[model samples]
Target chain A: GSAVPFHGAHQAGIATPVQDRLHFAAFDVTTEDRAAFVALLKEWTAAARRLTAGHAVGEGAYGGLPEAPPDDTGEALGLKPSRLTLTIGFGPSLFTRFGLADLRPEALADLPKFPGDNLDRARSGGDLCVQACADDPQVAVHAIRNLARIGFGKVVVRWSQLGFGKTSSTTPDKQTPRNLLGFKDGTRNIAGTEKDRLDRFVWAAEKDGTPWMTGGSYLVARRIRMHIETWDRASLQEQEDVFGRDKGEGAPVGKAKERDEPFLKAMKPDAHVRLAHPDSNGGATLLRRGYSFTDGTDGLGRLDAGLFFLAYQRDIRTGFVPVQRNLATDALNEYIQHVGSAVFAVPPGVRDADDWWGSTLF
Target chain B: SAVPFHGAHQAGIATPVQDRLHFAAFDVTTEDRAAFVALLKEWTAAARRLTAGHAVGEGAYGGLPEAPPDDTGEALGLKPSRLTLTIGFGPSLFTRFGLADLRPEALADLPKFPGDNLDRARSGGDLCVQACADDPQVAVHAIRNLARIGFGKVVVRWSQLGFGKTSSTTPDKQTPRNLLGFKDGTRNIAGTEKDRLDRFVWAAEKDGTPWMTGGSYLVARRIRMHIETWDRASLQEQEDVFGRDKGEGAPVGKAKERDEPFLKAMKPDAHVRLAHPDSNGGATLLRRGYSFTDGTDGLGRLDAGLFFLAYQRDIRTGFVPVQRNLATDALNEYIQHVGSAVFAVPPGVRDADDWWGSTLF
Candidate 1:
């Protein structure tokens, strides 16, 4: 319920313990004026700082000039900070406007359509993205809604998603969260406390030729739709076979513990754990902070539920692209589909009170 | 994370409001009354186990490997989260199964209120199960498993997922906000107020419905808010619409949220003034609503609003008069009632042998 520090060596959300709820929004830049858009970013940065610290924005939701809209939407009033972290990312298309073509990094390139992907255009791409994570849904929602309000003229929401449960955890000591498929997901994910692994796999370096993204990370988001009825009908052994893990203990095939090193050869070659293993893709790792979502029914008496797969890495080309390409024949693919995808260059954290998001770039 | 499933009255009606809600209305697909009643008994047993932090049937795992797991495994490691499953019968329920004689007059059809644009698909059903818990997964699991249990005999007609509680029976807790970003239920009936509960919430045999003596009436409305338009309005206009300041939710001409309203000082058509019990013949309702965001509409605006759930002794003197009085509410411009339903909630299970709707069935 306390605030996560806003100023850090790296952005807080990427490495901080995953929150219980998420309100992630993708915005389309609406204004043509460069100065106006820059001002909006500054405004959003200031507001985000206050919101994350559990304080109201500007003159606050009320007690200001009654004729104007309250600077802060009042829904989050009297609510705790809830460890809220607002992380901003610059999407691929944003470089086209604002004359930042030269500043665009290779790591932020548009994601390729992976095999078996059926992407929804409306839910896929955006000019920019903001991820608001908090233990309380209302508090997370309030942060994003207020950001959209503050950027009224500068940007419009292209798409937004709400996630209820954390599917992955950064604090590895805590119990690993489960995905909608009922298996322990992200069991072998990069831990937040592992600084060496984070640098090697998650955080970008200046040597990568993206100086502005030195402390930044690349993000890949995928909306995976899990066919609930199809999976529920499968036998327990079949379900276990798909994930290569026992349902009850989450142990790997032929192993007694969830954390035991898996004998990849012992499981089916196309098993999810074996294919997604780091050794399969040259030790490529992703710091996953995904979430589970259920957006009502599919109008066919089936649930429209899935895992919102979020991962951060040093480079999408090596981190996500290779691993995903390797998952083309995954056994779990039968009951799931990739319906939406996006990639963004998440810039470094705000260093201090004077520094703002995208300051290193602009 | 646990709540007792057996009591004189249902748990959800007066229990502390949970953080999440998964409300499902079902249509009995079968005409065999015996089969339907048997399903109810099974559901009651499942509800008891789920509310007490146990899985249904043989559980999610280690069961018959050849058969589908009795319980869905998603909520396997989850806490019970103080889960409560409250069941009710709609008006159409009595029309079948030779139960017409048992239908209470108080379980009347909700009248078409002014400015209501109700969607038939989302409105009424033969039965409803209100699942509430501190965790969304827990609530969803309870409803999903019940719907699974009722695969052949019943099907989900319409369901809603609500993320944040909009009102509370325990007023001592921090007042939650509706989609309008205003503190709602500031003056809500307290769970501890037994006198008010008996007068306006719990039903009595003397009210002419012996089968519903310990039960309550439920009025569920999906009130959709035009948040895009409301957010564009100025603070003064917003405050005038509700006749309360947005920050403190204070009544017009008052300084604090807890301050009693001076009705004469507020605008005649203000929401607080028109919906107050004083303006509606002292009609009182115990509200346990929740805020919901269901992705977006085709127009790109958030399809979000308050799932208004109100429980009362009788709709005749409670929601009917109160909603009728709101015909002139100034806040109507920014909201619309899109779905509606009313249910006769039977008394709770009294003991191990008791089951839901035992009095009526």
Candidate 2:
């Protein structure tokens, strides 16, 4: 699993549990009115604080530096809050246990109905997901409300996209799916193995910053718009040939089973070169957890079924890079496009009595 | 001041608190180990659930279909688990109140430092902020500890980036910044404000979606490499001749501050017309938020800065279209670009019981 870092408490105060589905939204405000927006944000936060129970606050705009000092000076620096974005994720129990009464009428109305047995009926559909950035919490809150009203399954709100830094010269080893093209992703993931897991995931034991931030990790979200209709049209053999794996079991073309495929097997003359080819460049891997989305039919009779790939790596470049580059011209490209892309540096973990980014690297 | 349609309860359990920093982390484990991962996630959520006492819960991913009958197969469909992505938000009460204990010795060794006063110092610096997305509860707890230890300011943690649609357009009121002696930017924009904004911004309401869900914007972070040394010499002279503005924010070759010197005022055969011939395209851009940074001095012993620009509209065509046309300008060859990125679909507001972009469009 990938681990990220943040600075603050971990309480929401609201009785409802956070959901799993995450969505990103962003907007651009006038730079001239930055101070006004900031003030508005402050006021909004105050309101939220008074209304909620479990709540924690952290940094925005810039991550490394502290908030503007009390004696702030001149022209307010004129940082026209660039498009404000927030990453939001929801909790499941909140839905299963609680009904519409637990949510705002508008939100309840917008809520995506449980898929139920639809999976058993239709073998194909379409889904679209998106993520954006926000300048302040006021805007962020606005975005979240909008998502709830829009009825996306789950939404996630985050501050910034931490770019995974370059790690190893070769792809790292991890148990996560590589981008459509296969390669071990998130090889050098944080917080998986115990020894490193604590340092990588938990921020409590580390002697860094605060105490409240003890069990947190990093987060990375991606809205991958897949072209499924084109993919579905391909013959099973073509699909297997393109993925270089058996269609049903997802095993290497020549292998007997999914787990038995020898990743080292060289690419055959006519086999898909991207997936089978070993990395020429030393690349790191990221632990990816993605869900398929069918955002309905786009007037164009095409099914949008693609993975919302999210991976957290100690270093983004090392973790996500090589895999992406390898997938550049892979057969999958024929049916998919990198329509939306973003990189957020997952902050280091936090623990009780620990600082932000309070891990071994620091 | 733009009130979203959905009230607090309608907004969802997670209320969007402005300025209050929010953060959450999560881990994506293999499906083979889905049970273990789910258990771990649930446990973590339970541990942190106390914090999100009333504000956290699952949100809608896709638009929900109309309520169906009990006999409908919708109930039996393979509903993907609305896995929990822990969320929390608040103000600096904890920091200001000093409610928490001191950071642990091990954690203290991390790179947590206070902010530097740059405006006073007249020094510009670049900053990078990130919210990791793996194991929300763990991430939240870690962030709290970081705040206690004093590493920058702390905001609440939400699950995703709000409504930043990939397609946004240029604003109508914006005028291009003339660089060389030419009327160098944005000559063509969408026909009307409605069309323009619609092209660049997400108008979910107009598109028949919920009220607060109407517009979704975009964010682009870029580090532009400036070529100062090459830009200082003859270029300064060129600016004097072609640009009517004096090197710094003023009209070039003009003595008066407010005087508007006509492009025709220059000699008919002057360099102004030549550098920016009628055929030469003008350069324009939608000025976004950006910070300056000092690059490695070894490459060039001169000042280096980065340009962070953002644009909002309904489509990239109206925004980036003009910028691309200007890429071939005389100034194009002088600059080098190092870092670039784009983030789409940011989150919307979170009232009492709703999420950003959780609407049915």
Candidate 3:
């Protein structure tokens, strides 16, 4: 429900450029033909660069390579690539399909007009398919006629359930469950980033897996909704009590000292033990990269405030699982709800034409 | 629906100390009255300065003279003795009201909450009222509540709505109107620069209404709601026409050019003109204030968007009234539905004796 503010300090003449436009798209590939999927992704990336003009790519993996080789190792081992390749396009207006301006009272009356009478006609008249790629299924359908304009052939899309780690690993920098609200979230991540990377991508001397197995990653997506009104209305005291920290300074309440503590010392005195108390064993942690989204307003006057949570780790158990378990009954749970969640095994990064996960898995 | 980014930034700790909070209080007195109001204002200013850890009587406005020498060769001219004394608060929170952090989700939630919430909270609340020698009803009940919370009170709450043109004069550096948007947004806001100071600052001498001498400015609050229920369903249809987000920003189809105007020259067939045509010869008002309010829904569902527009001019025609006429447009006609009201802000500082809107016509 929040309005996206564009950079209005004139970029050029008489025109204000929309600073940021949110876009998201997802595709599913054959599990066995992982290499083939990578090839297709590379081709798509090339096409995207040509189309959008600026791009950045990141590999989502369960784990990464170790710092140094073992004493017995005679040769060096390379890092493994994650399965899915995520590419973000920036500053290309040509690729933007869905766009809106400040929705004000004046814009309301023009809601019914169609075809030539709307903003979509000018922007989406030329290429619909490429534009629709920026948004979701609902948005694409609304602009279906425009999509057909770009000559996009029959494209199949489906949804699938995916899973990540469940067991804790012994490696350093491995999964430790620690929630942002001060609890354990993912306790079952891979033991070691290095071993996880090797397991997903590299072929050991004793392994029967094929060469195509190296350099793969996993992908997890979640849509979280935050109840801001409820949160904001709460007194600062209540907020601090729930989060186990002073709202103003973000320090443990009643603890005047700063950053001086053993893991157990950081816990709040009156905090709920199940939520804020640290276990003797270290907690799990997951690297989170997510974007905030407002999924329009439900006519009833409530808005959805949540993050599109994405986490990548070599193993599911030590990555996101344990940390989530710790947050199940957190104080923040009162104002946050997980609406949509998904997990996918991101395949290894592809180098050449012939590599695919199917060859190794089969 | 835009986030209250600017407002929040202003109030945050990192903001510069030079940014000030200015306010004035006005009082109505009989024609024969002495400068008691001005003297009282001076005392209040001194107290405030002491409380703020500053030298007393530092920024208080001086009182007007009781009598003036006659300019005419033979006859002495009578002069009005009333004056509106002005006082300002410290270099404080930049966005005192959190207007800068306003986001889409928050904008969606604002109206649903009770308006009275602004006054209920004690730590930080809204609308302060001060009624000195005058009655307090003019300022509204909310204003009194705010005053009780110590947020702010009327220092020079005076009004002169029906004052004759000869009795009133425009401030030299008042806010200006932006051409395209058609609102009297503050162009030369304070703290823009030390050198460009006079371009935005105003002195009581510039405005001759002695009864309004200390009153520094006016604030107009407007709450605008976007018809989203009608909007989302028509996204495809609207985009096909105007080629931009009808709710916010400029006219551009792609994300990169979202702020860029799809020039009539480039896409003459573009929806720019159709969306925003110059109904009355391009007359538009400038809007410089920030947006506020939380989402309307408690469960985080639907929210409301507000246009926190502010203008400063000697005359209504020079500000809000003209812009309202300009907005009688086809493009604006469709996307937004203006609800709420137009409030005429009286000028003032915080004090117990001054009445709210006591100087109004």
Candidate 4:
């Protein structure tokens, strides 16, 4: 009942309505065998098609050969699809191997260090990444774990984040939830179904950069650690001044409705809303899908919690880089720190039964 | 809406069930007795405010003041969704902060069970908090804030997240399924049995520790489902493991779930038969567990499984013997116990002046 078409012009997760949970993993290619690496991708592509339809790997776990490993984990049996999406991306490190250096897109290069980045090396980058989201956390885990098993020796997990806690919501039925700052974000975006928006803001068009990346987009993942301790001690007016939005309504400083036109000048010079809005970044925009996480504590009673920011754009020069640059001087820098970062070139989706991820590049 | 934070016993013990949970264990860091107690008071106030769907204070959300923000402000416009925060004191906490005499005799370290692969970081602790709410974020927010305010006073030892499985469906029609792909919980203890609660769940005033009269003991086990191997087994093999019909959850020789299990007809090593109270000297446990997924292991496997939490009147007669009987269960081949702990959850706060561990304090 809840499924996303696994084959398309672009990946399902980038434009997919953000789901209730995320089990994202980053992997490092462990072997030098290029053919074997390609085989894993093809196998994973086929599995994704099956999983997205609420089906199983091969015939299924119970019916599979009893002497061999299960093709799919059966934990998700009888569960609703809950709109699961599996989006894949190739990191810059992937091209370093597999005889792929010459094929790497310039936009897929590792990101430059930004101000105040206490980046955790363990979580920063990977050779490949998988984004699995579903309404039921079990369903997401079942699919991601099963596929990761297929590449047992070829890929080793670099890092992964289990996320829930939506940051925006007006009501239960349509809840996307709000951020740690307690304001609705990503109110506008480039729709995946629209041809013009995709061409302008998302998909990598021919002649723009790498020809093999014609249908792909670049992904930027950042782990933001919110200093709730310090923020919890802040004054209400100061908090509002930093985000330039009303805490209750999530509206721009000068407006009462979330969707009302934002008055740029009514906000402070370094307000987060004023700096990150597309209107202030030369109309630059990217599709955002993020979740909140709390990794217990910082070993000192401090909660190691924050937003896992993920976005996709055609190019970094016109996307995250510029928007982040504008926010470097924002008032929010005091209560939060960017602690993890990664970038990947997410290849176009499988066209149909014959096409697979990274079709042109491979 | 959430349960009112004040009561005769912790709300979560038998409060309306929520779909998700974030349970955390902590270790005290400071030697200052007054400071440690003060932090608990602050946490109690904050927990009450949050559970009531209000910001941490009257003007905590947004005001033109110079103080750090009170509420994290994330759960705005969201209902409390039955959020309940229950605090428990561990065995180790009694040895510190001048609280040794307050420790319950029943709140001792759990013995190492057969085949346990427990991790130290995920094991014992001085304190613990159980937060559950219908809305996952509300539950997460409560735990995060409690940990935040307790800075310097305490540090986290281990934590786990779990979601309700069987009850998530329209309860009366469809039963819940676990990672094993079988209908389960056909013989759970009913919450309405006051006599059973008195005898098997809540501690009595005449018990070893008077402070725990209305309190309960909690046992937590992080069980990893060796899912990949079990997935390859045939449906018949799976059915044989649990000794229940795959869809109906009835005992092997019974035709209906409510009918008494025909233990004699069950296999010698069946899981249900071994775990049944009739087979374990009539011992029982009030189960309150939820499933969890911890992404992939650094290796190729997925580190996903169930975070099992159960509460009872006494450990020796409640879970220990039942689990001892299960040492030879057929289902043991598919799960590994990787984390463990036991704590004495305090009785609920009686009023505004009443805080966690109030009776002892």
Candidate 5:
């Protein structure tokens, strides 16, 4: 349905039903002028709102002056909205520059280096990011491309990932999707429909940090590279054991159904599901909005594929770090490696027609 | 809606382009010829059910309780969305199992071209399956199941997941843009042109092996785009290289996307002018390609590119000449021809009793 509203108290993409495809890009802000950067955010907000609404940026509205560059790339002209959502976020480094050091939230910063993190310098850090999610990948790409096109002088695209097969579901009725490992993921995820849970586990509290981040949330993006060939070689039993869930049913070990309570004791000591569970990690739960990405081959006779993991929480001090620390010995770690990591403090959504992406922060 | 699986020709080749594609190439593993043929039969039957939006043996809801599900249930809720599965065989395939005599002369490997830096692993395959559908899940599900069924008989040689159609066989669909932000397939062969199909696309009985009378040839090229380099080019420079306006997608001298090309007005090394049939002795082929973005290339550059697939009656007469003409085109500076392969696509299944490769097998 093309019914996702673009304006609200919060960004549409985070709590949105997990789209089937994604085109996520992180940008390196080049222009050091604060006014120019803030103006870019305002321009980006206007464009993002239009794109999420399924119109071209400046759209048919931006036509003319044939000799000049176009405001909207016309590739998405005829495509349906496909429920596209264009989300904007500010990374920790944004505060480092722009003389906005005090603007940095207490809980927001560069992702702490994790164990076994073979982070790629090229893909790792960025000043800003746009999480474009939609059922049609082209729509997502079109939105991000327009953002990049307009912000050419101010920001250069550092890295981008085209994602397919999202890793979560919004409602109980919808089937939780699979990762490349062929197992259902996010059965215990927080659904957007649970407004109360989102307020607790997702939306940033007013006193938690900066005032501009009142309704905003934080985003932790992890680019995990899967050992596809190695995973494919493992026996199904071993795979099931490592995940601590049935490949077909997605039920935790000792459970009969997906929704059944997970008995962590039945799982192996190093099982991923058991270690990542709320019970095992001091009740920390982050809303998962991850997607699987397969990026051709690695020139090593193997598919360079893995998860583009995105998690949202009220605060990372309680969300990803604690959970990640608990997973140091997880069995799934052997078959996957974290290649990229970035943390962004997403601002509250533009509240009114005149409001823009970072109006309050500025 | 589901496309008709039983047809005179493969469904995907001439089918209107879909929004999603999952093309996979497999290397045959079983030395038992009958076993390989049997696997093909199994794959064909499963493909028939999948393209029609059904799980084999009703596995979506009810199946034997103790056994593994026959169909991966991920696509149970999705519409077929005009799903089509096209099968093709590579040159190495014919040599296996003593099928050399049946190898169509036109199905040979694509010769290396100028400035070519082909990756051997991604270049060729013994057999290939092209799954196209409007729904991404439906397209992916078909390939996953086919791979599962071919587990012991074949292994994945290489696979590509493409989103967004860059080229089309149907004339009515909107032209899509590559990563370079330029429109592609502005002047592609239309599926409705039967006369053109007979003249340039479908093989004639007199053309090659009798078993391949109704078959065609497929050439796949993995053209990697150098986005950073292309982004540096000026609007005028980009337009000159491609022989079209950036947004209008028109020929250099024309005002609209579909306007006839004014070849003489374009730069001598312009890509469109060189690739156009008018410039190449009336040579033409069907283009059904898709755009792919594979994250970053470890370095700062994006590993974004086009999975270019073209089908013709004869490579020597059609694609060979077109590519040779572009060997020194201006656009080559922004693109690296990274991978290449060609496959023989036989006639489609004739009836319920017929299988994918029954014409030759």
Candidate 6:
């Protein structure tokens, strides 16, 4: 994958084709000074610009003062940008202490607990979030590690996740990637080329009352732990019925091709595809960029692995909340559990050199 | 990314390092030697097909619906990705299988080192399989299939998935950095250096047991790094500990990363100085380690470090002395060896009918 532009009307990662790897982090702001936080944001933006362009931050990995740490970590030296994209988001907790409670967007409210959610508090909420994605794992990790190093006093990593493989994509031309369940996911995802869909369902608008959030999107992250050993023991017909798609062709029920229009009535009532469809959720759609994560074992001889579900939408109330509520009856819920959750208000992209993240609000 | 499987030696040992790794250590549960031999043959057959971009036995789908699929279907559309599977037999294995007389003297267990906090659950195994590939999914699939094939004969004692490779056999490419932000294996043995490889990495016919003539010894250590503490140290202090400039990766007095270090010019306890071949009687190990991060350490810090894997003709002259010399290493303050294992890696399968450990059997 080639590099996506850093400067854009909206962020690059949302509509850009999903990368091969992901290193996402949630940070808790430890500082209370408004200017210090804003300055950190500006510094982060400057580094993200250089990093996404395949250049090092500040003096780079070398040629710096010998007594000080190198400006950029040397891990990514001699490596291409790998289509790296760094997108920043502000959580509801960030507005409480910044003396700007009024600036908090209504759409940035915390997500409500859903059925089968066993959320871990340590991995759930954060004051800030960064979604660093790249085709190379080192590049993505390097980006996040450097940012954390730079924000030493201002922020601390609340939680971080390393995703090995992507489960969804924005470019439909490529083969639809599979989740850990071995079933094709995101078959009905919003494609990057669909400008109308992006504007209507993905990006927020100024007319919706929060000018700072215009052109921006909302991010809902859920760490879903899958029952892998259990799923492997399921019969092929049972697995097919769970996803309502053929294992070989990924064709929906009553269809022969992956892209064919689904005959929802032919599928089982509690199937994942039928329950999560937009038509069933009052015409709601999300641009999913999920990734599979295998974080060692669960101390019980099972892989603590599943899809790290990331969705971008115009509003949480209508986009994620309602859809999740509708999925209370989803049979797929038995094989998955939501262990971690976070919601962030993604700010509009940097327009130029002078523009920084959250410049509109600050 | 396709790597040739059949050769004079096993593919993964001296081959160019892949970007991802799925390493598993298995404990044999079956007491029947014949059953174990049959499983090894089945594993070899599957390994040959997997490396060639082919499916195992019946394909994942289109098989008889009455039985479970032969191969997991996750890697169905993925490319070969230079997948290589290297199998090894641990010292404990010879205790069984009525093969005690065939055990190589050089395959003895590694002695305890300073600052060792070995976790028994993650340490030793009767068998090991190292799967490397450019894609994590491919590597993971290979390991999963093998563990599936050995379902009753063995159980996984411990396993690790590494995302970033720490060392490279193909030294011509730019050196990769470890999680500690330093270029590791700057002077490691190269795949093209056949003479040095034979002298240091491979065992000869007279070097040990006859079956191990073309084999190598593998020493795996899970070295957990305290990155937060290392990051908090001053750059000067960090450089002093590592004996290399953070930016250029150059030695204390050297200007280039690959330049020979004047070991005497650095602190005696510096990491590079202590671990250097000059300090350890020219002991060398062909390192093929990878960086790993399990998750948080329950206290909020990351559980990240290097999975130290090295192969050599003999551990006595390779990893043993080098690690012993590091008893006083300054870098030990920020790292600890939490898991350890050693295995007698066998020679490669030579042909279609040849199975793993054929030389011994």
Residues A10-85 of candidate 5: C-alpha lDDT, one tens digit per residue: 9888888887788889998889898998888888888877787777777441244545545575667656778888
Residue A181 in candidate 2 has what lDDT? Answer: 21
- List-wise, what DockQ does each model earn? 0.54, 0.01, 0.03, 0.43, 0.26, 0.44
Q: Comparing candidate 2 with candidate 5, which one achieves the higher lDDT?
A: 5
The reply for model 2, stretches above 4 Å from the true place, is A1-20, A27-143, A146-223, A252-261, A266-283, A348-362, B1-361
Q: Write the per-residue lDDT of candidate 6 for residues B240-352, one digit (tens) a residue.
A: 89888776788888899988888888888998889888888999889999998766555557788999999999988999999999999999999999999999998878888
- The better candidate by DockQ, 2 or 6, is 6
Model 1 collision count: 1
- Candidate 3 overall lDDT versus native: 0.28
Candidate 6 per-residue C-alpha lDDT over A22-84 given as tens digits, one digit per residue, 9 for 90 to 100: 989899999989999999999999999999987888887766566666677667776678889
Instruction: Give model 6 RMSD, 1 decimal.
Output: 2.5
Better by TM-score, candidate 2 or 1: 1
lDDT (Cα, tens digit) per residue for candidate 4, span A97-149: 87888988877756777889899988889999999988877788877777877
What number of clashing residue pairs does each candidate have, in the order they appear? 1, 283, 167, 20, 0, 1
Clashing pairs in 6: B1-B82
State the lDDT of candidate 3 residue by residue for A12-33, as single tens digits.
1001111111223322222334
Write candidate 2's Cα lDDT for A171-280 as tens digits. Answer: 12322323322122222233333435434432222243322223322233444555544543344445555656543334565666555534544444334443424343
Residue B20, candidate 5: C-alpha displacement in angstroms: 1.0
- In model 3, what is the error at residue B314, expressed in angstroms? 9.1
Over B66-129, each residue of candidate 3 has an lDDT whose tens digit, in order, gives 2111110000011111211122221111123332332111011122222222311111112212
What are the runs in model 3 whose C-alpha is more than 4 Å off? A1-241, A245-262, A265-283, A290-310, A340-362, B1-284, B287-361
lDDT of 6 at A298: 62
